[PDB]
UniProtKB/TrEMBL annotation, chain A:
It comes from Acinetobacter baumannii (strain ATCC 19606 / DSM 30007 / JCM 6841 / CCUG 19606 / CIP 70.34 / NBRC 109757 / NCIMB 12457 / NCTC 12156 / 81). PROSITE patterns: RIBOSOMAL_S2_1, RIBOSOMAL_S2_2. It comes from the Bacteria. GO terms for molecular function: structural constituent of ribosome. HAMAP family: Ribosomal_uS2_B (MF_00291_B). GO terms for cellular component: cytosolic small ribosomal subunit. Gene3D superfamilies: Glucose-6-phosphate isomerase like protein, domain 1, Helix hairpin bin. GO terms for biological process: translation. InterPro entries: Ribosomal_uS2 (IPR001865), Ribosomal_uS2_bac/mit/plastid (IPR005706), Ribosomal_uS2_CS (IPR018130), Ribosomal_uS2_flav_dom_sf (IPR023591). Pfam families: Ribosomal_S2. CDD domains: RPS2 (cd01425). Keywords: Ribonucleoprotein, Ribosomal protein. This is Small ribosomal subunit protein uS2.
From TrEMBL, chain B:
The keyword Phosphoprotein does not apply. The N-terminal domain interacts with the head of the 30S subunit; the C-terminal domain interacts with the body and contacts protein S4. The interaction surface between S4 and S5 is involved in control of translational fidelity. GO terms for cellular component: cytoplasm; small ribosomal subunit. It comes from Acinetobacter baumannii (strain ATCC 19606 / DSM 30007 / JCM 6841 / CCUG 19606 / CIP 70.34 / NBRC 109757 / NCIMB 12457 / NCTC 12156 / 81). PROSITE patterns: RIBOSOMAL_S5, S5_DSRBD. With S4 and S12 plays an important role in translational accuracy. Belongs to the universal ribosomal protein uS5 family. One of its GO terms (biological process) is translation. InterPro entries: Ribosomal_Su5_D2-typ_SF, Ribosomal_uS5, Ribosomal_uS5_bac-type, Ribosomal_uS5_C, Ribosomal_uS5_N, Ribosomal_uS5_N_CS, Ribsml_uS5_D2-typ_fold_subgr. This is Small ribosomal subunit protein uS5. It comes from the Bacteria.
From TrEMBL, chain C:
GO terms for molecular function: rRNA binding; structural constituent of ribosome. It comes from the Bacteria. One of the primary rRNA binding proteins, it binds directly to 16S rRNA central domain where it helps coordinate assembly of the platform of the 30S subunit. Belongs to the universal ribosomal protein uS8 family. Keywords: Ribonucleoprotein, Ribosomal protein, RNA-binding, rRNA-binding. It comes from Acinetobacter baumannii (strain ATCC 19606 / DSM 30007 / JCM 6841 / CCUG 19606 / CIP 70.34 / NBRC 109757 / NCIMB 12457 / NCTC 12156 / 81). HAMAP family: Ribosomal_uS8_B. NCBIfam families: PRK00136.1. This is Small ribosomal subunit protein uS8.
Amino acid sequence: MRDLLQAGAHFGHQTRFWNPKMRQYIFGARNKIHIINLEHTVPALNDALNFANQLASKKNKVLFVGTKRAASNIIREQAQRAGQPYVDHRWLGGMLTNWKTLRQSINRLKDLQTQSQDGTFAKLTKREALERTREMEKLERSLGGVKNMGGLPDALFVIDVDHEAIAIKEAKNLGIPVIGIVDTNSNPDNVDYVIPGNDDAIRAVTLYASAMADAILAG
Amino acid sequence: LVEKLVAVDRVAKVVKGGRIFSFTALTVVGDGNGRVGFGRGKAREVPAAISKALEAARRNMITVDLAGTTLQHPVNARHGASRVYMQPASEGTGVIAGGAMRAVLEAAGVHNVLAKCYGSTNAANVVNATFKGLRDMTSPEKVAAKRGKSVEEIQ
Amino acid sequence: SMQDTVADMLTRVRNAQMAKKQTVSMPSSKLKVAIANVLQQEGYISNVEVAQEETKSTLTITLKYFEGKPVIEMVKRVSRPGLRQYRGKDKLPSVKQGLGIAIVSTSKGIMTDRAARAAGIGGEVIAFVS
RNA sequence: CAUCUGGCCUAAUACUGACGCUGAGGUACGAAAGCAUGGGGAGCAAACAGGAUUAGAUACCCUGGUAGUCCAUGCCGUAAACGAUGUCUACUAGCCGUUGGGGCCGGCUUUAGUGGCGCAGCUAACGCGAUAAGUAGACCGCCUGGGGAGUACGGUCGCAAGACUAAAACUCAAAUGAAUUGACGG
RNA sequence: AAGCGUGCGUAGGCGGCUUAUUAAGUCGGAUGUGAAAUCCCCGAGCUUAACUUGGGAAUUGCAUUCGAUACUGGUGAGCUAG
Ligand SMILES: [Mg+2]
Ligand SMILES: [Mg+2]
Ligand SMILES: [Mg+2]
Ligand SMILES: [Mg+2]
Ligand SMILES: [Mg+2]
Ligand SMILES: [Mg+2]
Ligand SMILES: [Mg+2]
Ligand SMILES: [Mg+2]
Ligand SMILES: [Mg+2]
Ligand SMILES: [Mg+2]
Ligand SMILES: [Mg+2]
Ligand SMILES: [Mg+2]
Ligand SMILES: [Mg+2]
Ligand SMILES: [Mg+2]
Ligand SMILES: [Mg+2]
Ligand SMILES: [Mg+2]
Ligand SMILES: [Mg+2]
Ligand SMILES: [Mg+2]
Ligand SMILES: [Mg+2]
Ligand SMILES: [Mg+2]
Ligand SMILES: [Mg+2]
């Protein structure tokens, strides 16, 4: 609970953009800045973090969502350092709902990333080869961390309840579970395992991500 | 899961050189024991639109607790400008109801009911209203559950 | 001017239950308190507390929720000052076939409809709660 | 600028003790135009005259121009008199402005107004959203397909112009609201 | 389709809180009345059926009388949030 008050999760956002529905977990406004309740963060982070290991026991994976440009380069690492899927470029409308749609893109991408570096693709033009490389690279831009999935996930783990709405809505549509770090300027409306915290900091985001990957590591 | 096609209409859209025609269909599915759902489909032909509607109806299904094969209490419901009233009857009567209502009652497993539509009799809005009325009707168990009593202490 | 003070209590309660408030506080009176006690016995609210300041008294109700819904679903005034009701004893109204209560004022106090059919009486119909 | 005069806000302290809300009939006020008697009359300008434009032009445009617009004393009683939203009361997330005060340490909070967003709820949709079209209570007014017709006849009022009250025979199967896709716009 | 152009006010309608009393509204019981036929229910004659007919139920309205007082009204006495 001191490591909770240690990573930078003490401060939230400014006292004009606060979603009024998040006042049960607000402390005060110091220098016009609201602060989350550590009693409501550290005693709820662990209640949520039990579920990650309690799920990986049966070995059903969980998707990880972060793209806010201040936690994408940490979600790239701390999510494939635990053997799970990832998405960190953009939410790409209708992936968990039109999965039978993006499946063909994922198949073509696996075929273009599996037969271009191990199948000895020769007897072709250099310009066409570079074009196909750039094409599969842009296809990997937003499908690479979700390549070896083939199924729909069992739970999502978000980093901004606000910036990832097209994901939380799709989760609620498909009936999956969702856990996110809702801040003060974010509604706690449908994320079913809600954890408060300062989603905008590199340190707090990375510490929560490390705790998640460790929770999933005890598998 | 028995299927009941309620409405099929032909709708048109103007383009630069004439009209583009198409079809909508509105269908109901259910088993006969407390689960029903409804859906809508659109397509350039009638069987394709029916298929689309049935597939959209096999989701959006609900469950409804009912006293044998009639309602637990009288229900008022509405959607848009349509109002529906429903009353539990006693065994030996059928579904005294009109058109769009029956398919929602017959497909959920209701056999004795007195039903009447006021307001607009748009089939889609009537089906929506009846669905909403069955979805929010309660039984003698949830009432005693939420009130901290038992089923005997209440009636 | 405010002329029905019992409809005002029912409205304060109805509005609080859909704003998800924890408690609701109104001015108090003997009839308001009696009705709130009938609500408490039936299990629709949790606690009723009156408190006098020096001359005026204030009444605080504590509400109930269940599965994220409010426990009072419907509460309705029946006998307003512009039209009083006065049912007999064969005509006492049953609310939702008996899954809800009807508050009645009789010469033996305030009670529910099923509690007055037993006694064989029945006067003014205050409200329906379901 | 002076004189006469009505309401509102705001702070304490005192006083009376339900003295209240709404209101059929009834009364008061009520833009502009118009009327009556007596004045005044710069600019503007119905009517009117002439010049153009036009197939024609009793119009738009140009040059003039009288009622009228102004004052005193009365009448009329109507307007898209509109927030197209009766008056009164209570309750229900928040954020950003502005006017008149009170309190507190440039900022916070409160009170009465006046604006922009917006959750829930409401709505056919558009939208409304503490200045509700939300949740309720009290009383009043009004509606019941389009036309005929806000007219005829009767009555009241008015100097008149007219206002108010207010039908029928006959005729039709539509008239209407909000949004949608095209097409079209001097 | 439908808020009078706006106020003010007469008859009327409706009206804060506490208490004592009254018992008009309200509620309950008892008694008389509510013609017969008709409607409805058992079941009896018509070969069946219409039809006729025995008995009930109903006519929940009216009046008289004895009680109950939570609410509304009346009366007296208090209060201060309008
Ligand atoms: Mg003055
Ligand atoms: Mg005194
Ligand atoms: Mg008045
Ligand atoms: Mg009048
Ligand atoms: Mg001119
Ligand atoms: Mg007018
Ligand atoms: Mg009007
Ligand atoms: Mg303001
Ligand atoms: Mg101010
Ligand atoms: Mg707005
Ligand atoms: Mg309103
Ligand atoms: Mg409306
Ligand atoms: Mg006339
Ligand atoms: Mg158009
Ligand atoms: Mg209109
Ligand atoms: Mg008006
Ligand atoms: Mg009076
Ligand atoms: Mg009175
Ligand atoms: Mg009496
Ligand atoms: Mg008789
Ligand atoms: Mg007194």
